[PDB]
Amino acid sequence: ALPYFDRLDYVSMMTNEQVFSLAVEKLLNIEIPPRAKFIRTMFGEITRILNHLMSVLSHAMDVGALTPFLWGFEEREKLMEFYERVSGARLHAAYVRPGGVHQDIPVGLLDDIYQWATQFGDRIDETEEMLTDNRIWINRLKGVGVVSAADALNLSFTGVMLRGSGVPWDVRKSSPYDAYDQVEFDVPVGINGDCYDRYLCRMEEFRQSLRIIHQCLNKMPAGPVRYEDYKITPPPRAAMKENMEALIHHFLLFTKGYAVPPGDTYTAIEAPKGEMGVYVVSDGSERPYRVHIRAPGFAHLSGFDHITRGHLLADAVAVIGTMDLVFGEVDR
Amino acid sequence: PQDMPPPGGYEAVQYKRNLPSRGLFRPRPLLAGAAVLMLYGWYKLVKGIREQNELAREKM
Amino acid sequence: SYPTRTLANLRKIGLKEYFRQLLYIGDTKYGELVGVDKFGNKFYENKEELPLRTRWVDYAKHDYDA
Amino acid sequence: MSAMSIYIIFVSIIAILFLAIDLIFAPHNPYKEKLSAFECGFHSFSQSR
Amino acid sequence: ATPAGPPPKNFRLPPPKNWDEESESTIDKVGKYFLMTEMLRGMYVLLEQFFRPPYTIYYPFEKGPISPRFRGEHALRRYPSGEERCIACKLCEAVCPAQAITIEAEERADGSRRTTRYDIDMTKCIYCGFCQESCPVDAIVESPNAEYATETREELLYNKEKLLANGDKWEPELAAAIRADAPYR
Amino acid sequence: AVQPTKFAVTVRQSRNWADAKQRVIAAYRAWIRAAPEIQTMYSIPFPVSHIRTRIRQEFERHRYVNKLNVVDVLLQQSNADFQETMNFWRQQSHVMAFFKELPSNFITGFLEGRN
Amino acid sequence: MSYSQTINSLVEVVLVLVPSLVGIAYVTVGERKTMGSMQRRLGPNAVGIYGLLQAFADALKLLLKEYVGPTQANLVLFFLGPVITLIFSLLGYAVIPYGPGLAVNDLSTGILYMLAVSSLATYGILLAGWSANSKYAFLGSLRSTAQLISYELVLSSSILLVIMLSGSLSLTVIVESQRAIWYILPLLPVFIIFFIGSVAETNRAPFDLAEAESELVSGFMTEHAAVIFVFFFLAEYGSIVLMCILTSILFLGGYLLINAPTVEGSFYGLSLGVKTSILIFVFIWTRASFPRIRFDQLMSFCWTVLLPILFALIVLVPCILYSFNIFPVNISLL
Amino acid sequence: ISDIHITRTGKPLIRIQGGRSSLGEHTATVFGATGQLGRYIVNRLARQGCTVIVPYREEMAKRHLKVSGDLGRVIFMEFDLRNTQSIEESVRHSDVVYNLIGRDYPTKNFSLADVHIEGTERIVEAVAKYDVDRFIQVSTYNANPDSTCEFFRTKGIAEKVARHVFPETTIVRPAPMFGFEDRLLLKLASVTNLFTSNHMREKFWPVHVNEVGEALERMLYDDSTAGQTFELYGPRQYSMAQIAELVDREIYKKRRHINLPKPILQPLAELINRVLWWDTGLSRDQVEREFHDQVIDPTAKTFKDLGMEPTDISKWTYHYLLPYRPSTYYDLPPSTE
Amino acid sequence: YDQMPDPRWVISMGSCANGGGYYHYSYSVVRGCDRIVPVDVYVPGCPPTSEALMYGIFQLQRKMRNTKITRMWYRK
Amino acid sequence: SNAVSITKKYTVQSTGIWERIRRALVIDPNRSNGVPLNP
Ligand SMILES: NC(=O)C1=CN([C@@H]2O[C@H](COP(=O)(O)OP(=O)(O)OC[C@H]3O[C@@H](n4cnc5c(N)ncnc54)[C@H](OP(=O)(O)O)[C@@H]3O)[C@@H](O)[C@H]2O)C=CC1
Ligand SMILES: *P(=O)(O)OCC(C)(C)[C@H](O)C(=O)NCCC(=O)NCCSC(=O)CCCCCCCCCCCCC
Ligand code: SF4
Ligand code: SF4
C-alpha cells in the first residue's frame, strides 16, 4: 500500500510516504534508527522545497508571471536527481517505508546536496526579486482570499492557510516527528490572512527548509537505515542468500507481509500543503482493515466559496493557487 | 564506510533574504536625471521651432 | 551557443561539418571520439562543456532514434 | 492607379488566398460533438444570448 | 489560536502607523510611484539571466543523468552458462502492488523447476522495483531503458520470450547496475 | 459557511407517516413537472411521456415500504438525484444510462446458456 | 513620370507588404527565442537552421488544419470578425514613412488614419468573440471592449501632445521636426504613457486580458481554429510592430540616423528598423517580467492615473509654447 | 443466439456471450469497413468479442474502429484491391467475409466496373480459395446486369459473379441509408447540394444504417441465410422532396435547390468529378440514378425474415439533424409534427 | 477530443491511461483511455521520464513523416 | 548584508574581463548563475 501514498500529493511523495510510515511504525511499536530519522527529515525538506517550487510558481504563472516558473523548474529538476539517486525514480520513489528507508544513500550524495545548497539561496532571491515588491503582484494578492484566524480553524485549515491568518501552528513544532526536534527552524506567520501573506510565508519556508537541510547534512549519523528486525524489514540480499533465518524472513515479508498489532491510530505530519494525516485501523493481520487519508487540500477546497464569493473571476484564479491544490490528495 | 559529512562539518550556506538596494533604482537619481533630459530636450526644441519659423518666413 | 564558442568550434571542425551539425544537433560541438557502437553510432566527450552536455552521440542513421 | 488603392486590394486578396487554401486543402469532417460549444469538457446552459 | 499559558511576548502587534508617521520622504515615495522603480529592478534581473548560460540539453543527442538504481523496462536474466536464473518461486507475483505479473510453472523435461508462462502487463505495472527487490536469484530486473514507446498496447504485453530477449540484449548494463548497487541491497 | 447550491435541500427526518406521504407526492410531482425541462437540457430524442413513465416506475419500486427510516433514505436519494439533474451536473450519457430502451422461461434460459 | 503609374504603385506596395509580413513572422520567432533566453531556455532551434523556419511551419500547419463552425455560432460574423481585424490591422502600414515621404500614402492626416484603422480592427475582436456563442469567448470579447474604453483616449490624448509640437498630423513632418530633438526628450512622460497605452492597445502582457490563458481558455479566440486563429495572430503581431513603428515615428525620430539614393534610403530603413526592433524587444521583455493586471485595475489605472495626468499636460504644454514663442507654423514646410 | 454455433464447414464455436472481454469465437473480415456502414457491423462483431480483420487503405481514417473491441480483437491489414496477396492474407483465417466495398462515382484508377466487378472477383475468388464459411456481399438496391445506370448495373453483375464462384453468398441489397454521417440526411441539411436534375421527386424506402448493421450481424448467426438474397428497405416510401421537407422542419432552415436540365447538368457533373479530388456528390451516373426510382424486387427476403421491424426515418430526424439547427431554434424539442 | 480538429493525434502517457495502471481493479477507473479515444502511441512508465515522453513524441513525428497524404489520394 | 561570497558557491565562474564586466553590471556580484561544476 505504500506506493499508493506516493500518488496522493504527487509533488510531495516522500512526505506522503512518511505519514504512512509513521502510522504503521506507531502501530508496530518500533523505533526506527537515527540515520533513517535524519534521512527522512532531510528528504522531508527537499520534498517541501520541491512542493513549494511547484506550488508558488504555478500560482505566479496563473496570475501571469511566466519567467519565475522556468527558473524554479531547473532547481526542482536538480532535486529530482537526489530522488533518482537514492531511489530509482524521479517522482514516485517508494523510498520512505515503515521501519526506515529502502536503501542507504549513495557515497557521493551528501556532497552534491551541499553543493546545491550553497547556491539555492540565490535562487530564492531572484524569484523574490520579481514578485515581493512588484506592484502588480501586490495588487493581485493583497486583500484577496482573506480568512480570519477564528474562521480558519473552524474551516479545518492547516499549514499556510492557517498560519497566514496569524496563528502560530506547525505540526513539526507541536508534535515533533523524525529528527525535527533536533533542528532549529523558524515558523513564518502572516498577519492579514490574504494571498499576499500566504505568499510571504511560503517564500520564507524556502529559506527555512534550506536551513534545516544544512543541519541534517551536518548531523547525519552512521548506522543502519532499516530497523534491525528482519521480521519487519527485509534482510540484506547478502544475508538472504547466506543464512536460513534471513531467507525465511525475506520469503514471508514479500508474500504474507508483516503483521501489525491490532488497533487504530490517527497520525499527522506537517505536509508541504498542511496537516496531512492518516487513520489506519489494524486487524492484527498483514492487511490493513481501513486506511483513511486526511488530505489538507480536501479541507481547503471546501472553504473556497467562503472566501471567494464576492471577488472577480481573476481573484478566483488567485485563490486556487494560494490554496495549493493537488487533486490526487483531494479525491484519493 | 557510509556517506558521512566531512570531519568538521560543512560550511554555512546563504539562506537569509538578500535583496540589496542598488543605486540604479533609486527615486532621487532617476527623477533628477529625468529632469535634465527633459529640460535639455525643451532647450533644443526652443532652438528648433525658432529656426523652423524663420525657415518658414524665407519660403513664404 | 555564443560567439566565442561557436567560432572556436567552427574553426576546429570545418565549415562542411558545421552545416552538418546545424542539420542534426542544431548545435556546434567539438570533442574527442570515445568509441563507436555496433550500429555505427559515434560518441564524443568534452568536459569543457556545460553540465549534461559533456557527452553526446553522433547518430549513424539519418532517421536517428534514441 | 494609386498605391493606396492597390494596397487595399492586396491585403484583401491575401485575406482571401490564405482563407481559400484552408477552405480547400484541409479536411472537413463536421460532427455533433466537434461542433458543440467549448465548456471545458462538460455541456452547460446556453446563456450567452 | 496561540499556545496556552503566558501569551507570547510581544505577540500583540504595535499600533498602526498613520500616513504622516511613515518615515519615507515624499520625493522618494512619489519617485518610486511614478518611475515604476521596483519593476525596473525586475526588468533588469531578467537582463542578467539573458546573459547566463542556458540549462538546455539536446535530447536525444544528449541524455539527462540516471543512476544505477534507475527503474526502466523489465528483463529476465541468465547465469554465466545461459541457464535461466528464474526458478518459479512466484515471490514477485505475490508482492506486486498492481498484479501485473502472471506466472505458470512446471517441472521441465530435465526435472528443473522453471516457468512455462512469464507475463508482465506493462500497462498495469507501477515501476516500483518491488519485484526485483524480492527476487532470491536476481532474475527479474528493471533495465536502465526508458525509450520503448510503442504503437499499440498489445506491444506492451510482455511474454517470457520478450523478457528473456530483453535480458539477452541488456545484460552488460544489468550486470553493471547490480555490481554498482548490490552492496546497498 | 459555503452556500448550498440551487436545489440543495436540508436533510431532515420525516415526522410521521403523513409527513412522508406528503413529501413523496411532492417529490413525484416535482419530477414529472421537470420532464419537459429534462428533455431539452439533455436533448432527449424520446418524447416526455417515456421520461415520465420511467419516473413513475422508479417510484413504484418503493411502493410497498412501511418503514419511515427507509423512506427517508429514499427521499434523500431522490432529492440529490433531482438536484443533480436540474443543475446539469450530470451529462447526456448519464441521463441516457438511465434509459434501457433475463430469460422469460427456464427452457429459453437453458438453451442459450444461463440467460 | 518615367514608367507606368500602376507598376510604380504595384512594386511599392509589394516592397511594403512583403518585407513587413516577413518581419511579422520573425517577431514571433524572436519573442519565443528572447523569452527563452530570459528563461534560461533556447527557444526554436530545430525548425530550420537556428530555428529560422518556425513561423512558416506554424503558418503552413494552420492553413492545412480543419476549420470548425460551431452550431451555436452566428457563422457569417464568426468569419467576418477575424477578416476585419486582419485587413484593418495591416492597413496601418500604408502611411509609415521609410524615409522622407517614402510611404505608400504620404497623407496630410496620417495620424488620424492610424487611429481610425486600429479602432475598426478591434471591433472585429469584439464581433468574433460574441459570434462564437460560447462563455469564454463571450467573456473574452467583453474584456476587449473594456480595454478599448481604457487605452483609446490615452493614445489619442498622448498623440495630441505630439501634434502640438509638430503642428502637422503628417507622419513625415513629425519625423522631420525631430531633426531639432527627438520628442522622447521634451515629452518624456508622454513617451512612457504612450508606450503603456500601446501595450494595452495591442492586448499584450501585462494587459493580455481578452486572450488570457490562465483565466479564460483562449478568451475571444477559444472557438477559433485553423485560418481564423492565424488571422487573429497576424493581426496581433502585426499590430505590435506597427505600434513600435509609430512609437519610433513620434518619439525617437522615426528614420532619422543615430545607387546613391539606394545607399541613402537603406540608412533610413535600417535606422527606423533598429529603433523599432529595440521597442519590439521592450514588448517581449515586458511580457516576460510582470504578472497580468486585473481588468478592473487596468480601467481604473487609465482613467484615474493616466488620463488625469495627460489632461494636465494638454493644458501645460501649449502654455510653455506660447510663453517661449515656439508654436510651430502649421503651413507645409518639412 | 445460443452458446454453440456450428458453421458450414462444420467447426463448432463454444461461445461466452457478453462484453468485449468474452469469446464470440467468430473471425470475420470486413472489406470496405472504413466507410459509413462499415463501423456498425464492426462495432457489433467486436463488442461481442469477435476477431475482426479490417483491410484498410488510408491509415488515419481507420482509427475510430479500434475503440470498438478489446486488445487483439480488431486487426488492421493494409491492402489494395489490385493486391491479391493482401486480399488472400486477410480472409484466410476467417469464417465470414463481408464485402462492403463500393463507390458511387468513378475515380482516375477505378471505374464503377473496376471497383465492383473486379474487386468482388478477387474477394470472392479468395473466399473460394481458402474455403471461408460465409460471404455476405453488400450490393445496392435496383442492382441489375441489364440496367443502364453504371451503379445499378455493375453492382448487379458482381452479384452474379459472386454466386457463380461461391454459391452460398448471402446477397444483401440495402435501400438508401440514413444515420449519423449519412449521405442522405446530412446532404439535405448541407449547403453544397444546390444542383439537381429532377425536382427531388424520385422515391425510395430509406432504411436506418443502424438496422442494417444489425441485419448483417443476424445473417452471421442465422446460418440458413446463406445462399439467399436480402432487400433491406424501410417502412415507408418517400421522395427526395418529402425527406427534404422533414429536414427543413427539423433544422428550421428551409434549404433551397437549383434545378438543371439533365442534358445540361450531366455533362458538367462529369467534369466536376473529373477535375476535383474530393467526393463532390456530382457525377454523370449519380445524375442518372437521380432520375431513377427504387423497386423492391420480390422473392427477396426482408427485415421480417431476420425478425426485425425497421423504424421510420421521421423518428430519427431530431437526433441526427440537431447539430444543424441555428442557435435560436436549437433549445427547442423534437419536431414530432 | 471530439472538439479537436483534423489532423489530430492522441498520445497515451503512463500506465493509468494505457491500461488503468495501479488502479486497474478500481470501481471508478477506465481501464485504459483507448476504451474512450483512439490512441496513436503509448509511452510506458509511471511516471514516464520527461525523455520517455519526448521519445514517444519523436515516434509520432516519425509516423507523420511516413504518413502518405497526397500520394494516398493518388492511390485513392 | 547576509550574502556569502560568490567564490564559495560551487558554480561556474566568470573570469578576467568578463568577471570585471559582470561585477560592474549586475545587482549582486555574489549571486551565482546556478550552473554546477563539471569536475
Ligand atoms: N449508403 C447508402 O446509401 C447505400 C450504400 N450501398 C452500398 O453499401 C456499401 C456500404 O455503404 P457505405 O458504407 O455508406 O459506403 P461508403 O462509400 O461510405 O464506403 C465504401 C467503402 O468502400 C471502400 N472502397 C471504395 N472504393 C474502393 C477501392 N477502389 N478500393 C478499396 N476500397 C474501396 C472505401 O474505403 P476508403 O474509405 O478507404 O476509400 C469504403 O470503406 C457500399 O458498397 C455501397 O455502395 C448501397 C445502397 C445504398
Ligand atoms: P397513494 O396513497 O397510493 O400514495 C402513493 C405512494 C407512492 C405515496 C405510496 O402509497 C407510499 O406511501 N409508499 C411508500 C413511499 C414510496 O413509494 N417511496 C418513497 C419515495 S422515494 C422514491 O420512491 C424514489 C424513487 C427514485 C427517485 C425518483 C424518481 C426519478 C428518478 C430519475 C428520473 C429520470 C432522471 C433522468
Ligand atoms: S521472484 Fe524471480 S525467481 Fe522467483 S518466480 Fe519471480 S522472477 Fe522467477
Ligand atoms: S516494478 Fe512493476 S512488475 Fe515489479 S512489482 Fe512493481 S509493479 Fe509489479
E96 appears as a binding residue in the annotation: yes
- C-beta of residue F20 within 8 angstroms of C-beta of residue F14: yes
**Torsion from C-alpha of H266, H268, H269, H271, nearest 10 degrees:** 130
Size of the A and J interface in Cβ pairs below 8 Å: 27
End-to-end CA distance of chain H: 38
Residue from C22, C23, C52 to probe the interface with G (highest G Cβ count within 10 Å): C22
Please judge whether E61 and C57 are an interchain contact, meaning their C-beta atoms are less than 8 angstroms apart. Answer: yes
Phi, psi of G263 (to 5 degrees): -65, -40
What determination technique applies here?
Answer: cryo-EM
Closest ligand to the CA of F37: 2
Per-position DSSP letters for H122-152, written without gaps between them: HHHHHHHHTT-SEEEEE--TT--TT-SSHHH
Cell representation of residue H239: 421522395
- Which of A44, A39, A54 lies closest to A15 in space, CA to CA? A44
A295 Cα distance to chain centroid: 12
- C-beta of residue A140 within 8 angstroms of C-beta of residue A313: no
Chain I nearest-CA residue for H115:
I76
SS3 A292: strand
User: Nearest CA to CA, how far is G130 from chain H (Å)?
Assistant: 13
Which residues lie below 8 Å from residue A272, measured CB to CB, with a gap of 6+?
A: A9, A11, A12, A15, A47, A48, A51, A52, A55, A159
Measured in angstroms, the resolution is 2.8
Which residues lie below 8 Å from residue H261, measured CB to CB, with a gap of 6+?
A: H197
Phi, psi of G57 (to 5 degrees): -65, -40
Cell representation of residue H210: 443502424
- Which of G198, G79, G93 lies closest to G150 in space, CA to CA? G198
Instruction: Enumerate the H helices of chain G as residue ranges.
Output: 5-38, 54-63, 75-90, 110-131, 135-166, 171-177, 188-201, 226-251, 260-289, 295-301, 307-323
- C-beta of residue A36 within 8 angstroms of C-beta of residue A104: no
In chain C, residues with a C-beta closer than 8 Å to the C-beta of J38 are 47, 49, 51, 54
CA–CA dist D5, A108 (Å, integer): 74
CA–CA dist A203, A185 (Å, integer): 14
Residue with cell 520517455: I52
Phi, psi of H174 (to 5 degrees): -80, 155
- Which of H229, H228, H220, H208 lies closest to H309 in space, CA to CA? H208
Residue with cell 493518388: I74
Residues 138-167, chain A, touching G (beta carbon < 8 A): 139-140
The C-alpha angle with vertex G205 and arms to G199 and G206, in degrees rounded to 5, equals 95
CA–CA dist G207, F47 (Å, integer): 50
Cell representation of residue H48: 461481442
- C-beta of residue G124 within 8 angstroms of C-beta of residue G81: yes
H103 appears as a binding residue in the annotation: yes
CA–CA dist G167, C25 (Å, integer): 56
- C-beta of residue A36 within 8 angstroms of C-beta of residue A322: no
Cα(E91) to centroid of ligand 3, in Å? 6
- Which of G195, G200, G196, G189 lies closest to G310 in space, CA to CA? G189
- C-beta of residue A232 within 8 angstroms of C-beta of residue A31: no
Cα(F79) to centroid of ligand 2, in Å? 11
CA distances from H51 to A226, E104, E158, G274, H69 (A): 52, 26, 21, 67, 9
Subunits touching C (CB < 8 Å, at least 3 pairs)?
A: E, G, I, J
Subunits touching H (CB < 8 Å, at least 3 pairs)?
A: D, E, F, G, I
CA–CA dist H303, H311 (Å, integer): 11
CA–CA dist A36, A103 (Å, integer): 10
- C-beta of residue G113 within 8 angstroms of C-beta of residue G193: no
In chain A, residues with a C-beta closer than 8 Å to the C-beta of J10 are 115, 118-119
Name the residue of E92, E126, E143 to mutate for ligand 4: max ligand atoms within 8 A of Cβ: E126
- C-beta of residue H107 within 8 angstroms of C-beta of residue I76: yes
Chains B and I touch (3+ CB pairs under 8 A): no
Q: At what angle do helices G307-323 and G188-201 cross, to 10 degrees?
A: 140
Side-chain-side CA neighbours of residue G174 (13 Å): 31
Chain J nearest-CA residue for B13:
J4
Burial of E178 (0-12, 13-18, 19+ CB in 10 A): middle
User: Nearest CA to CA, how far is A64 from chain G (Å)?
Assistant: 4
Q: Is any ligand 4 atom within 6 A of the Cβ of residue E91?
A: no
CA distances from A211 to A55, A80, H75 (A): 20, 19, 60
- C-beta of residue F59 within 8 angstroms of C-beta of residue F26: no
- C-beta of residue A205 within 8 angstroms of C-beta of residue A274: no
A130 lies within 8 A of chain B by CB:
no
- C-beta of residue E153 within 8 angstroms of C-beta of residue I38: no
Chain A nearest-CA residue for I26:
A332
CA–CA dist H227, H229 (Å, integer): 7
CA–CA dist I51, D48 (Å, integer): 43
CA–CA dist I71, J3 (Å, integer): 66
Ligand 3 interacting residues, C-beta cut-off 6 A:
E 86-92, 103, 134-135, 137, 139-140
The C-alpha angle with vertex A104 and arms to A100 and A106, in degrees rounded to 5, equals 155
Fill in the DSSP letter of residue H207.
E
Cell representation of residue H167: 454459391
Residue from H56, H57, H60, H103 to probe the interface with I (highest I Cβ count within 10 Å): H60
Exposure b/e, A79-105, CB count within 10 A at least 16 = b = bbbbbbbbbbbbbbbbbbbbbbbbbbb
Q: Is any ligand 2 atom within 6 A of the Cβ of residue F81?
A: yes
- C-beta of residue G173 within 8 angstroms of C-beta of residue G334: yes
Instruction: Enumerate the H helices of chain A as residue ranges.
Output: 2-6, 13-28, 34-63, 67-86, 109-131, 135-141, 149-154, 160-163, 171-174, 195-218, 237-242, 244-255, 296-301, 304-308, 313-322, 327-331
Per-position DSSP letters for F8-75, written without gaps between them: --------SHHHHHHHHHHHHHHHHHHHHHHHHHTT--S-HHHHHHHHHHHHHTTTT---HHHHHHHH
Closest ligand to the CA of E103: 3
Ligand 2 atom 23, closest CA? F59
CA distances from G242 to A208, G275, I67 (A): 49, 12, 40
Which residues lie below 8 Å from residue E184, measured CB to CB, with a gap of 6+?
A: A103, A104, A106
- C-beta of residue G95 within 8 angstroms of C-beta of residue G63: no
Which residues lie below 8 Å from residue F96, measured CB to CB, with a gap of 6+?
A: F42, F44
- Which of G137, A66, C50, I50 lies closest to J12 in space, CA to CA? C50
Chain H nearest-CA residue for G75:
H326
User: Is omega for the bond preceding I47 within 30 degrees of 0, making it cis?
Assistant: yes
Residue with cell 515471490: E91
User: Is omega for the bond preceding E60 within 30 degrees of 0, making it cis?
Assistant: yes
- C-beta of residue E152 within 8 angstroms of C-beta of residue E102: no
What residue type is assigned to position A60 of the chain?
A
Residue with cell 491489414: H77
- C-beta of residue A182 within 8 angstroms of C-beta of residue A155: no
- C-beta of residue G266 within 8 angstroms of C-beta of residue G231: no
Cα(A325) to centroid of ligand 4, in Å? 29
E125 appears as a binding residue in the annotation: yes
Residue from G71, G78, G130 to probe the interface with H (highest H Cβ count within 10 Å): G71
Sheet of H51-56, strand order: H74-78, H51-56, H27-31, H96-99, H134-138, H170-174, H229-232
CA–CA dist G152, J16 (Å, integer): 51
DSSP-assigned beta bridge partners for residue H172: H138, H230
I54 lies within 8 A of chain E by CB:
yes
CA–CA dist H86, H98 (Å, integer): 16
Chain A nearest-CA residue for E133:
A237
Cα(H38) to centroid of ligand 1, in Å? 8
User: Nearest CA to CA, how far is G39 from chain I (Å)?
Assistant: 19
Length of chain J: 39
- C-beta of residue E149 within 8 angstroms of C-beta of residue I56: yes
Residue from B39, B45, B51, B59 to probe the interface with G (highest G Cβ count within 10 Å): B45
- C-beta of residue E134 within 8 angstroms of C-beta of residue E92: yes
- C-beta of residue B18 within 8 angstroms of C-beta of residue E18: no
Subunits touching D (CB < 8 Å, at least 3 pairs)?
A: F, G, H, I
- C-beta of residue A183 within 8 angstroms of C-beta of residue A212: yes
Which residues lie below 8 Å from residue A78, measured CB to CB, with a gap of 6+?
A: A116, J36
CA distances from A86 to A37, A46, A74, A90, G232 (A): 15, 13, 19, 10, 50
SS3 A196: helix
Which residues lie below 8 Å from residue F66, measured CB to CB, with a gap of 6+?
A: none
Please judge whether A220 and B3 are an interchain contact, meaning their C-beta atoms are less than 8 angstroms apart. Answer: yes
CA–CA dist J35, J39 (Å, integer): 12
Cell representation of residue A129: 526579486
Contacts from A167-175 at CB under 8 Å and sequence distance 24+?
A167/E1, A167/E2, A168/E1, A168/E2, A168/E3, A168/E8, A170/A270, A171/A268, A171/A269, A171/A270, A171/A275, A172/A269, A172/A270, A175/A268
Exposure b/e, B40-53, CB count within 10 A at least 16 = b = ebbeebbebbeebe
Instruction: Enumerate the H helices of H100-253 as residue ranges.
Output: 112-113, 119-129, 150-165, 185-188, 209-221, 240-251
Cell representation of residue H2: 445460443
The C-alpha angle with vertex C40 and arms to C38 and C45, in degrees rounded to 5, equals 100
CA–CA dist G111, H198 (Å, integer): 60
- C-beta of residue A45 within 8 angstroms of C-beta of residue A216: yes
SS3 B52: helix
- C-beta of residue H294 within 8 angstroms of C-beta of residue H175: yes
Domain ranges of chain F: 1-115
For chain H, domains (ranges, CATH) are: 4-324 (3.40.50.720)
Cell representation of residue E140: 527479474
Cell representation of residue B21: 538596494
In chain C, residues with a C-beta closer than 8 Å to the C-beta of I48 are none
Phi, psi of A271 (to 5 degrees): -75, 160
**Torsion from C-alpha of I28, I30, I31, I36, nearest 10 degrees:** 170
- C-beta of residue A296 within 8 angstroms of C-beta of residue A329: yes
CA–CA dist B48, G186 (Å, integer): 12
CA–CA dist B29, B31 (Å, integer): 5
In chain I, residues with a C-beta closer than 8 Å to the C-beta of G71 are none
In chain J, residues with a C-beta closer than 8 Å to the C-beta of B13 are 4
- Give the CA radius of gyration of chain F: 18
CA distances from E133 to A92, A236, A251, E139, H105 (A): 16, 10, 11, 10, 64
CA distances from H176 to A33, A68, A89, G97, H149 (A): 79, 62, 59, 65, 16
Please judge whether D37 and G91 are an interchain contact, meaning their C-beta atoms are less than 8 angstroms apart. Answer: no
**Torsion from C-alpha of G139, G144, G149, G151, nearest 10 degrees:** 140
CA–CA dist A139, I25 (Å, integer): 48
Fill in the DSSP letter of residue E2.
P
Length of chain E: 185
Name the residue of F62, F77, F90 to mutate for ligand 2: max ligand atoms within 8 A of Cβ: F62
Cell representation of residue E77: 536474466
SS3 A277: strand
Ligand 4 atom 4, closest CA? E131
CA–CA dist E34, F76 (Å, integer): 61
